[PDB]
């Protein structure tokens, strides 16, 4: 998965998450055409019967969460990320750190994240304090012995009064933000 | 070099690869709009970040239209082929095929949507042709580029599965992985992009490519046909909206789980006034972790493609439902058996599906 975002001078705003599921998908390439094939259908439940069971012509449930936030009926922030089931948590944490904690956008994106979807599955990024992990595990959480990067948030903020844009790329990949300043 | 923070007066691009960001920015500089740029960026990332996305996959593209002031989503999520079956990922004993094996099987391949989505986006909002916008990526595929660190790590990590297909000729030339910062050349993909440029998206969804794609899926054990490719169309999805701390948030509905549960976790967590706790405090992480367990449980129970299943969206986001869930969370103790709630007590109807725990 990857997430990107664009905003232009006419007020159009795009927030786009896109994927082939695993890194390199199935690993299958269409011979003589170079196209790497998604394994997207493994996002369905393997055991049928429930909401996300496989059916023909059905789409597998996604965790992709491209998002645009608005203030006074104008778009002011885009957020999204790759990372499978962790995506929802990366978008959540970015919004929490930027809005609830009032952190500047790059800082909110870089704030160490955690993710956990059950009692047996935990991830944390470098910077989550060792004594916090000890305290949480002591209550019965199961954070592991080493950190892992979680997500990769690209984000744009828009200041409508000043007429300016700010773009941020997450250090978890080698992304780039590029502002437009037209010579005209 | 490139920057991970920038500012601008007339627009902005942020992507995971500097070559893609540069292509998107050039579209804006040359008078294109954010949709034109986004389409060009997708082709660019297909080439330069090939492990992560491209015309072999699908996506969710949220667009706010500065003219109409409407927000809509081009949903290019892949479809299961007509020959897919509920039990297709089970062995003869009715137990799940191990995930690491499941991922490499032809049954795993969804009918790709990304290209159809790009075509739709241009139909709706484009001011540059797909021919113009695909051209920079044709050149990157044909002439190559030197591989970045995230790419070179991928090839090494995934050598086994690449070695069993045609992908080996691209990523493992002479039987070994490309390194940083070796040149990645993708001549066949370039040719495919040229076919799309000349013939339109029928170069992908019909004709010889569609035959080769379906035969290949079938060679690897899946059921996809040329008819499945011909039948494919995107869906235009209406965002689901929530209010949070003075903001209105437009996010993605089913068949994505992301919008519902993003809104649900924000609604649960908003109650706790997190900023009262230090940003690196155990209290904050505890509340995050406990909320995740509850929301992820609801996701596993209730979320799927809404053309097919009755997702209790009204119940899952009902403020009294949110209240019940928040009441399950303590600073001082951890839920050892977090389970889905019952959103059906807060809305009409019932599930047209069962509660089936997935293995692991």
Author numbering:
A (entry chain B): 403 to 586
B (entry chain A): 37 to 396
Please share text taken word for word from the publication where this structure appeared:
γ-Glutamyltranspeptidase (GGT) is an enzyme that plays a central role in glutathione metabolism, and acivicin is a classical inhibitor of GGT. GGT is a heterodimeric enzyme consisting of large (L; ∼40 kDa) and small (S; ∼20 kDa) subunits that are formed from an inactive precursor protein (∼60 kDa) by post-translational and autocatalytic cleavage. The autocatalytic processing requires a specific nucleophilic residue (Thr) that catalyzes the cleavage of the peptide bond just preceding this residue to liberate the catalytic S subunit with this residue at its N-­terminus. Bacterial GGTs share the same overall fold, but B. subtilis GGT is unique in that it lacks a lid-loop that covers the bound substrate and has a tail at the C-terminal end of the L subunit.
